[PDB]
């Protein structure tokens, strides 16, 4: 109200409204799902178009051979944060000959987002990210909020109508975690999860976007006729 003009101002109840408004931009964004087993980690994203003549906005970005994310909200802010992850992954490789741990990648994103929430002049990031990766401690899935909060999860979903997919994963928890050494079945569970967030529209060939990473699987993105198999 009077305390939402900038990010440097707490409200009387201890809330940061500019951060909450940035969080709102994520809810307007298209749905994206993340889930993992012990061997693989999968991202599934519903891409959004402007109209029938337009293309479908890309949702998934590769950060390294063993790591990448899906976005929901302001796409340019995802480009900035993903560029930062690319650099950090790359600094780890060039200096330490070491693949960046997914947990440490989350800690870096948290700290970068935080600086924008405590200083005058700047603004919070207006995007939510789901980071997947396979490192020395196996498969991982992270959820990033521009408040700075990063959370490691078995599965999750962000964007519009994401509560439906999140409930499904909460039921299926015991099943999909056990899908080891079977990439196609893990993707099926992800495609079935994101389907719980659909209304009116359905999953078409240029609508669906899938990504996977695992034990002997580099981070690869599937679009177009490559995902027709899963429709």
């Amino acid at each position: 109200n009077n305390y939402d003009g900038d990010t440097v101002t707490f409200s009387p109840t201890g809330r940061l409204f500019q951060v909450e408004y940035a969080l709102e931009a994520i809810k307007q964004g298209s749905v994206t799902v993340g889930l993992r087993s012990n061997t693989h980690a999968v991202l599934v994203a519903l891409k959004r178009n402007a109209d029938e003549l337009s293309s479908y906005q890309k949702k998934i970005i590769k950060c390294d051979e063993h790591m990448g994310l899906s976005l929901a909200g302001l796409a340019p802010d995802a480009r900035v944060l993903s560029n930062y992850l690319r650099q950090q992954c790359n600094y780890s490789s060039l200096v330490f000959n070491r693949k960046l741990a997914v947990e440490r990648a989350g800690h870096l994103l948290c700290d970068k987002a935080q600086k924008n929430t405590q200083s005058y002049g700047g603004r919070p990031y207006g995007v939510g990210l789901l980071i997947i990766g396979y490192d020395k401690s196996g498969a991982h899935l992270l959820e990033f909020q521009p408040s700075g909060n990063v959370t490691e999860l078995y599965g999750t979903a962000i964007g519009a109508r994401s509560q439906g997919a999140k409930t499904y994963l909460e039921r299926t928890l015991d099943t999909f975690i056990k899908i080891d050494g079977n990439p196609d079945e893990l993707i099926k569970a992800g495609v079935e999860a994101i389907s719980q967030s659909l209304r009116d529209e359905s999953l078409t060939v240029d609508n669906l976007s899938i990504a996977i990473v695992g034990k002997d699987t580099p981070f690869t993105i599937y679009d177009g006729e490559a995902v027709a198999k899963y429709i």
């Binding site: 900038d6 440097v8 005058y120 002049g121």
Partner: protein, 244 residues
């Protein structure tokens, strides 16, 4: 943050005016009247000190008339402190020019430089403008005797006769009436003092309430002399012209 307290000194009004420049001009309109008159054989600078005291040391005092170099002088109307900042900058510019080209700075070039500084404070920096209006009286070998004025907007114009400060409307009408092109310095001296005597807010015009100066070729042969009048000399010229 800090934005909350920013007055925004360099913005347009909806009518396309600069707020701070207009308000600075309002300040200057309450300052003591300064008059400049240009003649064929010299220039006169006359100015009124503001409500003085008997205990003010006049002979060592200077609030209106300042020397920029040997050829150029200025009359001030507005904040004296603001004027001294600019005056020192102008003195430095005149010396820079002299060092570079080994010639005394042409009057207009000095005027343009000061006016450009004033302009900068109206377009960038977020600072208040200088609440000062100058009358420049000077001589060079290109245009001869010249009168200019500048104001907080950084705009400057040339004049045959001009007034700044208080009662300029009344003063300019009186100058426009009695001024002629073939006029001489002694006549211009009389015109300046008569104009002040009629426009002044004081009861009577006396020596202790005035600053006076002339720029004359009345120096031995082809050269120019600046004369900042002393209190006793202002008293004598007031008697000569028949005001006291």
């Amino acid at each position: 943050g800090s934005r909350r307290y920013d007055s925004r000194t360099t913005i347009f009004s909806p009518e396309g005016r600069l707020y701070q420049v207009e308000y600075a001009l309002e300040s200057i309109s309450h300052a003591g009247t300064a008059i400049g008159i240009m003649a064929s054989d010299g220039i006169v600078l006359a100015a009124e000190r503001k409500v003085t005291s008997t205990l003010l040391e006049q002979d060592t005092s200077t609030e209106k008339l300042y020397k920029l170099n040997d050829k150029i002088a200025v009359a001030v109307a507005g904040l004296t402190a603001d004027a001294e900042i600019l005056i020192n900058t102008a003195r430095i510019h005149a010396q820079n020019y002299l060092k570079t080209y080994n010639e005394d700075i042409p009057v207009e070039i000095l005027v343009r430089r000061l006016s450009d500084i004033k302009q900068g404070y109206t377009q960038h920096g977020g600072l208040r403008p200088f609440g000062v209006s100058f009358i420049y009286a000077g001589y060079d070998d290109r245009y001869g005797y010249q009168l200019y004025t500048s104001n907080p907007s950084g705009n400057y114009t040339g004049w045959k006769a001009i007034s700044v400060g208080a009662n300029t409307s009344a003063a300019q009408t009186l100058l426009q009436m009695d001024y002629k092109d073939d006029m001489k310095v002694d006549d211009a001296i009389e015109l300046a003092l008569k104009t002040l005597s009629k426009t002044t807010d004081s009861s009577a015009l006396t020596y202790d309430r005035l600053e006076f100066a002339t720029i004359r070729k009345g120096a031995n042969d082809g050269e120019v002399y600046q004369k900042i009048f002393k209190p006793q000399e202002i008293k004598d010229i007031l008697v000569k012209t028949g005001i006291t």
